[PDB]
Amino acid sequence: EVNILGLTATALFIIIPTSFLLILYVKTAASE
Amino acid sequence: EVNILGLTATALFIIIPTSFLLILYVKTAASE
Amino acid sequence: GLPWYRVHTVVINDPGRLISVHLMHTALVAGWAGAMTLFEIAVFDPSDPVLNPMWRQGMFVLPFLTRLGVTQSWGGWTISGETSSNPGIWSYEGAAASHIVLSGLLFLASVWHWVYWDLELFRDPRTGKTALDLPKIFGIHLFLAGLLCFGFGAFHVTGVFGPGIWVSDPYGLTGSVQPVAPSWGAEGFDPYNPGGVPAHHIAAGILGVLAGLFHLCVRPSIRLYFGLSMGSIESVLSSSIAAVFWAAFVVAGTMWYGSAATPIELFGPTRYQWDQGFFQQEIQKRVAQSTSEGLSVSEAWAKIPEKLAFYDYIGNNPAKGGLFRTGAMNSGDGIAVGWLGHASFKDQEGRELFVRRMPTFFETFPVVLIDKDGVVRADVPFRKAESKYSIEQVGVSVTFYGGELNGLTFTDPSTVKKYARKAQLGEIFEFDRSTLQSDGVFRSSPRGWFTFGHLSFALLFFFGHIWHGSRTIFRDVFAGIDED
Amino acid sequence: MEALVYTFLLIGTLGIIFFSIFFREPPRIA
Amino acid sequence: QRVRTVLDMDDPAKEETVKELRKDINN
Amino acid sequence: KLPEAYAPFSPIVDVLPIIPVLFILLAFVWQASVSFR
Amino acid sequence: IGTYQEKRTWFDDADDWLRQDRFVFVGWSGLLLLPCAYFAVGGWLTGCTFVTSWYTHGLASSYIEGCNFLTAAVSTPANSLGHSLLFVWGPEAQGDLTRWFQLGGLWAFVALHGAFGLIGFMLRQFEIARSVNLRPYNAIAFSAPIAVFVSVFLIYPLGQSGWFFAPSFGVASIFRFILFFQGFHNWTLNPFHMMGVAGVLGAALLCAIHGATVENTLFEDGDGANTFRAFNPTQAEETYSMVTANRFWSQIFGVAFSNKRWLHFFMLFVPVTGLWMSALGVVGLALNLRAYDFVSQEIRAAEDPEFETFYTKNILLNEGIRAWMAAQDQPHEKLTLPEEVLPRGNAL
Amino acid sequence: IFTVRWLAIHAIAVPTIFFLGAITAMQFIQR
Amino acid sequence: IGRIPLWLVGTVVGLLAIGLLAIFFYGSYVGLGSSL
Amino acid sequence: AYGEGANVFGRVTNKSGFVPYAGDSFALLLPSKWNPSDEKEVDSIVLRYADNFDAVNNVYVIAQDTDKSSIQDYGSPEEFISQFGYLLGRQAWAGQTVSEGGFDANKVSSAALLGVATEKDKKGKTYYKFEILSRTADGNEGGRHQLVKATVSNGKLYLLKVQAGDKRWFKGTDKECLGVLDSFTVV
Amino acid sequence: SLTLILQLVALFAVVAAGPLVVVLLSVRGGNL
Amino acid sequence: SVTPSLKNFLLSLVAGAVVLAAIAGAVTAV
Amino acid sequence: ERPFSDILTSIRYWVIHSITVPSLFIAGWLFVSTGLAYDVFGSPRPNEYFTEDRQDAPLITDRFNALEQVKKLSAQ
Ligand code: CLA
Ligand code: CLA
Ligand code: CLA
Ligand code: CLA
Ligand code: CLA
Ligand SMILES: CC(C)=CCC/C(C)=C/CC/C(C)=C/CC/C(C)=C/CC/C(C)=C/CC/C(C)=C/CC/C(C)=C/CC/C(C)=C/CC/C(C)=C/CC1=CC(=O)C(C)=C(C)C1=O
Ligand SMILES: CCCCCCCCCCCCCCCC(=O)OC[C@H](COP(=O)(O)OC[C@@H](O)CO)OC(=O)CCCCCCCCCCCCCCC
Ligand SMILES: CC1=C(/C=C/C(C)=C/C=C/C(C)=C/C=C/C=C(C)/C=C/C=C(C)/C=C/C2=C(C)CCCC2(C)C)C(C)(C)CCC1
Ligand SMILES: CC1=C(/C=C/C(C)=C\C=C/C(C)=C/C=C/C=C(C)/C=C/C=C(C)/C=C/C2=C(C)CCCC2(C)C)C(C)(C)CCC1
Ligand SMILES: CC1=C(/C=C/C(C)=C\C=C\C(C)=C\C=C\C=C(C)\C=C\C=C(C)\C=C\C2=C(C)CCCC2(C)C)C(C)(C)CCC1
Ligand code: NA
C-alpha cells in the first residue's frame, strides 16, 4: 500500500545532494 | 498517530521555496 | 579556491568565527533535542506502564530525560503510573521548549559572533597577531567542568537540592527517582551500585577544580609545548576527538552490559540477563518458594507480576532486531496485552517436560522439549515420517497456569506444538498486531540502537583523531617544505 | 511503486556514467 | 527452597545460567 | 608389478619421476653459480 | 627548540640512541611494537604447535595432536568464561602457566599483544615518517586494518556472549568464523559488507591496472632489451608516459586518470573506505543487529507457496548452517538435536 | 658482536630453529 | 670471506629446506593426523 | 601430569577399527570412530553409540523385561518383525496423497525384508538376525539398513539394532555393520 | 627396511648428482 | 581483607614495574 | 658493513654454527620426544584424551573454579 516513508527517504537522499553538488558545480563553472 | 503526509508537505513547502529565495539572494549579493 | 571537503578550514585562524560555528552547532544539537523530545511525547502512549513499557515504543531520548528526575508531562500522566503531581516548569514538554528556546538563543548569538569576529580579545597584546592562550583556556574550562561535576554530584543526584536519580529493583519491578546516598568505599566502584555515581561526581568535581586551579597557576613546559604543538588548535581538536571517542566507547560498553546509570526499566532488558536466566531465575525461584510453603501450584504463578514475566521474553532481547527492521519494538510483533502463563508440558505416562529456550543468535530454532535429567523426550519434527519423539505420538499435553489461561489444559497436538513454539521464546504473551500494523519479526531495543550508533561514532572518531593528530604533528609537510 | 524506484536509480547511474564518459572535462596537464 | 530442583527445573530450558555455571565442580 | 629380473630395482625406479623437477632446480643452481649474470 | 640553551638530560641521550640508522630501526615505538609483536607472533606460533584446545572447544587445533597448518589454531576460551582478560595471574589460572594454557588464556595474550603491536606499528609509521619528513599517509591507510582487527577480534566478542565467539588465531578456525557469519548472520547480505567487498575488489583492480599501465607505458630509456636496467633514480624525468596512458584508457574504458596525485590517492582511498565500511558492518553485527531478512520478500514467501528466489534459497542454506553446525560448534549450549528434526531434504 | 641486527636475527632464528627441530620430531610420532 | 661460495650456501640451504618440507608432507600420511 | 616419552618409532597399538565393550551380561565390539550420545529414543536403552560423521548410522541395544522362555518360543522371525513394527519409526502424518510411488496408498515410508537367520554361537545360545531396508518417499540416504540382533537369556530381552543409511552402505560401512553384528554376543 | 634404504640412497645419488656437476665445473675451469 | 585476586594484581603491578625497568636497562645498554 | 654477502661465504660463521644449529635441532627433538612439551603446555597424550568417568568432549562451564575443574577434567 505504498511505503511512503522509504519513498520520501529515497527521494530526499537523491534530491538534496545532487542539487547541492549542482549548485557548487554551477558556481565553479560561472566563477572561473 | 502523527500525520506524516502533512508533515512532509509542510516541510518541503517551507524548505524548497525558502532555499530558492535564499540561494538567489546570496548569489545576487555574491555578484552585485 | 577551496575543495568541498575543506570549507570549514577557513575558520581555523578566527576565534570569532570558530565560536560562531560552535554556537550554531550547539543551537542545532539543542534544536534536535527539543524536537525529538516533543516527537517522542507525541508518539508516546503512557496508558500501560507495565505491559506497554516506554522502551517498547522506541523511546530514545525520553529514558535520558527520565534518568535525572522528570517523570511527568503536561498531559497529566506519569510514566510510573503514580498520581500526577505538579511538575513546575520542568516537565517533559516544558524542558523540551526550554531546549528549543536555548537553541534559538544560541543561533542568535552565533549570528552575532559571525558578524563581530575581529575582537581584540582574540589579539595578542605584545605581538598584535591573532592568537589564543590555549593552556589558559583549558584551565578555565577545566575549572568550569570541575564546578559542574561538584554541583551535579553534591546537589542534584544526592537530592539535597535535586530530585535524585532513577533507582529500581535488581530485577526491574519497582523503581523511581529519589535521592541516593553516596557510597564512598570499594562498593562505590561497583558498576551497579547507584551510590557510586554521586560519590564519583563529588570527588571528580573536587579533583577538577583543583586541576583547574593548577592549570590557571602553572604554564606548560617548553619541550612538551613544542613536542605536542600546544599553540595549535587542530592539536587540541585531535585530543578532544580522542577524549570524546573514548567516552563513546565507555558509554556504549556500559549501555550494552548494564550499569547503575542504565536502568532496565528505562532502556529495556539486556541480552546478558536473557542468556544468564535472570528474570527466568527469579520466576522459577519465586514459584518454587511459593509451592514449598504448602501451596498448590495453580495460584503460585498468579503471584508472579506482569513485569517480571514480560522481562523474561526474548522479543524484549536487545540483541535480536535488525539493522533495517526500522521502528519501535512494538511495531515488530504487536503490543503485549496479557500474559498467558507458564506452559507446563506433560508426557502421557506423566513427567514434566521443558522447552529448550531459543538462544540469542538464532532467528528460528527447532522446538525440542527435554526432561529434568537432560535427555530429549519430545520435539516438533521436521521429517514427521521416521520420527519417534514427535508430539502426536508421545502425547504432550500443556496445562497453563497464568492470567488469561489458568486451567485450560490442551491435549490437541496442533495447539500443543503452537504453545511449545511460543514458550521456546520465554513466557507466552498476547500481542495485538492490528493496532500499529506490526511486522512479525523482532526489533531492537533503544539500548541496542544507542550502542550501535555510539560504537560506530567511536570508530569514525578514532579515525578522525588519528587523522587530525597526523595533521598537527605533521603540520610542516602538510603546509610545505620549500625544497628543504 | 516498488520496481519503478529501482528503475529510476539504475537509469540515473547509467546516465551519470554515460555523461562521465562523453560529456567529461577534457584531460588537461598531460 | 530446593536449590537442587530449580537448577534441574531450568537447566532443561537453558544450560547457560549463572547458578549452574557457579559451583559446577561439585556436579 | 615389475618383472622378475627387475624386481629389486624398484627402489632406483621409484625416485625417477622427480628428476625433471630437479632439472629446472639445477638450472637455478647453475644461474646462482654464474651469479645471474 | 627555538635556539634555546636546551640543557641535555637522559631523554635527549635516549632519543639520540633510538633515532639512529641501523639494520632494523627501534625508535620510541620499539619500546612497544618490538616486544608486543614478537610476543604476538611467538604466542600464535607456539599455540599452533603445542597448546591444545581440547579443554574449551572439545577439539584439536594444534600440531601436537594431528593438525596441519590449515588445521591448527590458537583457540578462544570457553563461552562460560565470558569476556575475561584471562590473565595468567587472575582468578582463572591463579599463577599457573601449564593450566593457563588449554583454557584460552593464550588467545587473550596473543590478541592483546597484537592490538598493542598494531598500535606500536602505527606509531612506528608515524615517527619514521617524521624522521624522513614525509606525510604519514601510510599510517592513514593503516588505520583501517586495525579498525578491522578491533571490530572483529574485540568489538564483536565484546558485544556477543564472549571470546568463544571471536575468531581463533588460525586458518580453519577463521573459515569456521566465515561460515558462522554466513549462516548465523547472513553477512553477505549486509550492505556494509557489500561495500567492503567492492572496496577490496576495486583495490585489487587498481593494483593490477596501475602496475600494467605503468609497466606497459614505461618509455625506452636506453638500448637494452631489458627494461628494468633502464631505470635510473638520478634523472628527474618521469618513467612512464602519463599522456599516452590517459589516451589509451580514455579510448578503451571511456574515462581515464589525468593526475598522478589523484590516481594514487584513489589507490589509497578505495581499500581504506571499503575496510572501514566492513568494520562498521561488523560493529553492527557485534550487537546482533543484522541485515538478515527482507520483510516484503519473507511476507510474500509466507503468503505465496510458489514464489521463490535466491534470497529465499539463501535463508534456507543459512538454516542448514545453523541446524547442522551449531550442535558441534557450541558444546557449551548442549545441542543434543535428533537428526530427524534437522532440515534435511531429499536423499542428500 | 651483540648488535641490534644480531639481537633481531637471533630472536627470529633461535626459536624458529627450535620449533623446526621440534616439528621434525613431531612428524615421526604415531598413535 | 669467500672461502665457501654463496651460491653453494644457498643451494645446500635450499636442499635442506626442500627436504624439510618433503618430510613434513610425508609425515601427514603417517602418525598423527594420518586419518587411518 | 607424569612424564613419559612420546611414541616415536614405537609401533601402533590399534588398527582393526573396533573397541571392546562389556555391558550388563553382554559384550560387543563398538566401531572405533564412534562416540556415545545420551539420546534415549525408546526409553528401554542401556547403551547407544553413533558415528561422528552423521548419526543416522547408530547402534543401540534394548533392555526390555519380557518373560516367555526363549526366542524359539517367541516364534518365527517374521512374527517377531510383526511385533516390533513400532521400532521402525512411525508416520504420524495422516494426510491423503497418492503421489509418492514405490510405496503404498497414503503411506510415506516402507520396510522390506532382506534376510532372516537363526544364528547360534559356541555355547549353543540362539540369536535372531534381521536385515530390513527402510525406504522413505524422500529417498533419504537411499534408504536405511536396519540390522537387528535379538536374543533373550535372563528375564530381560536383549535386542541390538544397527541402523545405517544406504548412502554409507556401499561406501565401506557394511563390513563395519556386519562386524558389529557378529561381534555382539550375550554371555 | 632395505627398500627404504635403497630408495634413500637412490634419492641422494640423484639429488647430489647435479650440484656435483656444478662444483666440478666450478673447480675444473669454467665455460658455463 | 586482601583477597587473592587483589594480591595477585599487586604482584602483577610489581612485575610490570620490573619489566619496564628491564626494558629501560636494555635500551640504555648496548 | 657486513652486508651478509661476506658472513655466509666465510667458514668462521659456519664453524660456530655446525654444532649450535644441530644442537638446537636435537634439543627440540629430545624436548618433544621426552614428553616435556606435553608436560609444559598441557596437551594430553593420544592415549589420555578421555578418562574413564567421561567419554564425551570436555566442557569448562565455570569461571572461578575453572582451575580446579580443568585439574579434575585433565589427565592425572
Ligand atoms: C545515534 C542517534 C540515534 C539513535 C541511537 C536513534 C535510535 C532510534 N530512533 Mg532516532 N533519530 C535520530 C537519531 C537516533 N535515533 C536523529 C538525529 C533523528 C532526526 C533525523 C531521528 C529521528 C527519528 C524518528 C522520526 C524516529 C526515530 C526512531 C528511533 C528508534 C527506532 C529505531 C530506528 O532508529 O530505526 C532504524 C535505524 C536505522 C535504519 C539505522 C540506520 C543505519 C545507517 C545510518 C543506515 C545507512 C543509510 C545509508 C548510508 C543512506 C542511504 C539512504 C537512502 C537510500 C535513502 C530508535 C531507538 C523512531 C521512533 O522510535 O519514534 C520515536 C522514529 O520513528 N528516530
Ligand atoms: C542550561 C544547560 C543545559 C541543561 C540544564 C541541560 C539539561 C539536559 N539535557 Mg542538554 N544540552 C545543552 C544544555 C543543557 N542541557 C546544550 C547547550 C546542548 C547543545 C550541545 C545540549 C544538548 C542535549 C542533547 C542532545 C540531549 C540533552 C539532554 C538533556 C537532559 C538529560 C541529560 C542527560 O541525562 O544526559 C547525560 C549527560 C552527560 C553524560 C554529559 C557528561 C559530560 C562528559 C562525561 C564530560 C567528559 C569530559 C569532561 C570535560 C571531563 C571533566 C574533567 C573532570 C576532571 C572535571 C537534561 C534535562 C538529553 C535529552 O534527554 O534531551 C532533552 C539529550 O539527548 N542535551
Ligand atoms: C572516590 C569516589 C569515586 C567513586 C565512588 C567512583 C566510582 C566509579 N567511577 Mg570514578 N573517578 C573518581 C572517583 C570515584 N569514582 C575521581 C576522583 C576521578 C577523577 C576525575 C574518577 C574518574 C573516573 C573515570 C575516568 C571513570 C570512572 C568510572 C567509575 C565507575 C566505574 C564502574 C562502571 O561504571 O563501569 C566500568 C567503567 C569502565 C570499564 C570505564 C573504564 C575505561 C576503559 C579503559 C574503557 C576502555 C576503552 C579504551 C579506549 C580501550 C579500547 C577498547 C577497544 C575494544 C576499542 C564507578 C561507579 C568509569 C565510568 O565513567 O563509568 C562509566 C570511568 O571511565 N571514574
Ligand atoms: C568534532 C570533530 C571534527 C571536527 C571539528 C572536524 C573538522 C574538520 N575536518 Mg574532520 N573528521 C572527523 C571529525 C571532525 N572533523 C571524523 C570523525 C572523521 C572520520 C570520518 C573526519 C575525517 C575528515 C576528513 C577525511 C577530512 C576532514 C576535514 C576537516 C576540516 C574541513 C571539513 C569540513 O567540515 O568541510 C566540509 C564537510 C562536509 C561538506 C561534510 C560532507 C557531508 C557528509 C558526507 C555528511 C554530513 C553529515 C551529517 C549531515 C551530520 C552527521 C554528523 C553527526 C551524526 C555526528 C575541518 C576543520 C578535511 C580536511 O581537513 O582537509 C584537509 C578532510 O579531508 N575530516
Ligand atoms: C614492555 C612491553 C610490554 C607491554 C606493553 C605489555 C603489555 C601487556 N601484557 Mg606483557 N609481558 C612483557 C612485556 C609487555 N607486556 C614481557 C617482557 C613479559 C615476559 C615476562 C610479559 C609477560 C606477560 C604475561 C604472562 C601476561 C602479560 C599480559 C599483558 C597485558 C595486560 C598486562 C596487565 O594487565 O598487567 C599490568 C601491567 C602494568 C600495570 C604495567 C606496569 C607499569 C607500572 C604502572 C609501572 C610502575 C613503576 C613505578 C615507577 C614503581 C616505582 C614506585 C615506587 C618507588 C614507589 C598487556 C596488554 C597479560 C595478558 O596478556 O593477558 C592475557 C599476561 O598474562 N604480559
Ligand atoms: C538492470 C540493471 C541495471 C542491472 C544492474 C543492477 C544491479 C546489479 C545493481 C548494481 C549495484 C551496484 C552499483 C553495485 C555497486 C554497489 C557497491 C557494493 C558499491 C559500494 C560503494 C562504495 C562506496 C564502496 C566503498 C569502497 C569504494 C569507495 C569502492 C570504489 C571502487 C572503485 C570505484 C574502484 C575503481 C574501479 C575502476 C574501474 C578502476 C579505475 C582504473 C582506472 C580507470 C585507471 C586507469 C589508469 C591507470 C594508470 O595506471 C594510469 C597511469 C592512468 C593514467 C590511467 O588512466
Ligand atoms: C565501450 C566502453 C565500455 C564501457 C562503458 C561503461 C563504463 C562506465 C564508465 C566508468 C564509470 C565512470 C566513473 C565516473 C567518475 C569519473 O569519470 O570521474 C572523472 C575522473 C577523471 O579524473 P581526473 O583524472 O581528471 O582527476 C584530476 C582532477 O582533479 C582534475 O580534473 O575519472 C576517474 O575518476 C577515473 C575513472 C575510474 C572509473 C571508476 C568506475 C566506477 C564504477 C561505475 C559503476 C557504474 C554503476 C554500475 C551500474 C549500475
Ligand atoms: C530564533 C529564536 C527562536 C527559536 C527558533 C527555532 C525553533 C530554531 C530551531 C531549530 C531546530 C528545531 C532544529 C532542529 C534540528 C535537527 C537537526 C539539526 C537534526 C538532525 C539530524 C542528523 C544530523 C542526521 C544524521 C543521520 C543521517 C544523515 C541519516 C540518519 C542517521 C544519522 C543519524 C547518521 C524563538 C522564536 C523561539 C525565540 C528566540 C529567537
Ligand atoms: C607463548 C608464550 C611465550 C612467548 C614465546 C615467544 C614470544 C616465542 C617464540 C617463537 C617462535 C617465533 C616460534 C616459531 C616457529 C616458526 C616456525 C615453526 C616456522 C616455519 C616452518 C616452515 C615449514 C617454513 C617454510 C618456509 C617457507 C614457506 C617460507 C620461506 C622458506 C621456508 C622453507 C623457510 C612465553 C614463553 C614468553 C610466555 C607466555 C606464553
Ligand atoms: C635414469 C637414471 C639415472 C638418470 C638421472 C638423470 C636423468 C640425471 C640428473 C640429475 C639432476 C637434475 C640432478 C639435480 C639436483 C639438483 C637439485 C636437487 C637442485 C636444487 C636447487 C636449489 C637448492 C635451488 C636454490 C635456490 C637458488 C640458489 C636460486 C633462487 C632461490 C632458490 C632457493 C630456488 C641415473 C644416471 C642416476 C642412473 C639411475 C637411473
Ligand atoms: Na533433497
Side-chain angles (χ1 to χ4, degrees), chain G residues 38-39 42-43 45-46 100-101 106, chain H residues 15-16 19-20 23, chain I residues 17 21 24:
Chain G
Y38 164 100
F39 283 30
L45 278 154
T46 316
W100 174 64
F101 298 118
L106 183 63
Chain H
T16 51
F19 273 46
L20 308 199
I23 296 170
Chain I
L21 277 296
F24 283 0

Side-chain angles (χ1 to χ4, degrees), chain C residues 257 272 319 323 363-364 387, chain G residues 134 158-160 288 290 322 340:
Chain C
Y257 304 135
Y272 292 83
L323 191 43
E363 282 286 330
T364 182
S387 296
Chain G
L134 283 184
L158 277 196
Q160 295 298 109
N288 199 1
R290 299 187 281 259
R322 303 131 70 90
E340 52 95 18

Side-chain angles (χ1 to χ4, degrees), chain A residues 9-10 13, chain C residues 32 36 39-40 43 57-60 323-328 445-446 449-450 452-454 457, chain G residues 192:
Chain A
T10 317
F13 174 109
Chain C
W32 172 86
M36 192 66 208
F39 180 76
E40 290 192 2
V43 308
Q57 314 191 29
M59 281 315 88
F60 176 49
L323 191 43
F324 297 97
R325 294 185 203 157
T326 75
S445 296
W449 288 114
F450 182 88
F452 161 68
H454 279 46
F457 289 146
Chain G
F192 296 102

Side-chain angles (χ1 to χ4, degrees), chain C residues 256-257 271-272 319 321-323 325 360-361 363-364 379 381-383 387 439 451 459 463 470 473-474 477, chain G residues 83 126 130 133-134 136 143 156 158-160 185 276 287-288 290 293 295 319 322 333 336 338 340-341 344:
Chain C
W256 193 245
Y257 304 135
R271 65 143 298 156
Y272 292 83
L323 191 43
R325 294 185 203 157
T360 302
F361 263 85
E363 282 286 330
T364 182
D379 51 7
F382 195 91
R383 300 271 318 287
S387 296
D439 206 301
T451 45
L459 277 196
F463 179 72
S470 177
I473 301 299
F474 275 81
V477 289
Chain G
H83 313 67
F126 273 128
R130 191 67 264 186
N133 198 10
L134 283 184
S143 60
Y156 176 72
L158 277 196
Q160 295 298 109
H185 282 299
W276 279 88
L287 295 174
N288 199 1
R290 299 187 281 259
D293 60 357
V295 167
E319 314 314 318
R322 303 131 70 90
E333 192 145 50
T336 52
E340 52 95 18
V341 306
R344 183 200 30 61

